[PDB]
Amino acid sequence: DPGLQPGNFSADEAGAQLFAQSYNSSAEQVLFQSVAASWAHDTNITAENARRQEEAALLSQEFAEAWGQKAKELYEPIWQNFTDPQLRRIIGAVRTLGSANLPLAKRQQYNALLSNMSR
């Protein structure tokens, strides 16, 4: 999907600015979809809505993971100097991939551990 997949970009301050500018164009839509599905679940508890809620949650997680991986591979060495506070905060927020840095087996074990503790 073009929306969930970032395009080619440049590893410079101007490239970072274009990265942040393009970040809205997909993040707005993805977050609106996910949070709207969650709101529909929380207002109409019917058994249909939970499937949409979980599908949108997975979609948002994958979008964030892909964008964060691209931002990492493009700006990790140059994550210090930007001469722009707002773009620095944006890049720091996107770069933090979190639990996606684990391999497949370890990521599955981690998600299973969280779910099992909750249960």
Ligand X SMILES: *[C@@H]1O[C@H](CO)[C@@H](O[C@@H]2O[C@H](CO)[C@@H](O[C@@H]3O[C@H](CO)[C@@H](O)[C@H](O)[C@@H]3O)[C@H](O)[C@H]2NC(C)=O)[C@H](O)[C@H]1NC(C)=O
Ligand Y SMILES: *[C@@H]1O[C@H](CO[C@@H]2O[C@@H](C)[C@@H](O)[C@@H](O)[C@@H]2O)[C@@H](O[C@@H]2O[C@H](CO)[C@@H](O[C@@H]3O[C@H](CO)[C@@H](O)[C@H](O)[C@@H]3O)[C@H](O)[C@H]2NC(C)=O)[C@H](O)[C@H]1NC(C)=O
Ligand Z SMILES: *[C@@H]1O[C@H](CO)[C@@H](O)[C@H](O)[C@H]1NC(C)=O
Which residues contact ligand Z (rule: CB under 6 A)?
7-8
Is position 89 an interface residue for ligand X (rule: CB under 6 A)? no
Interatomic CA distance for residues 11 and 3, integer angstroms: 21
Shortest Å distance, C-beta 46 to ligand Y: 28
What does 24 bind: ligand Y, ligand X, ligand Z, none (CB cut-off 5 to 8 Å by kind)?
ligand X
Tell the smallest beta-carbon distance from residue 24 to ligand X (Å).
Answer: 3
Instruction: Tell me which DSSP letter residue 99 carries.
Output: G
Question: In the bound complex, what is the minimum distance in angstroms from residue 32's beta carbon to ligand Z?
Answer: 23
Q: Which long-range contacts (CB under 8 A, 24 or more apart) does 97-106 make?
A: 97/65, 97/68, 97/69, 97/72, 98/68, 100/65, 100/68, 100/69
Query: Binding of ligand X at residue 86 (CB under 6 A)?
Result: no
Q: Write out the binding residues for ligand X, residues 7-36 only, by CB under 6 A.
A: 21, 24-25, 28
Helices 13-43 & 85-95 angle (0-180, nearest 10):
60
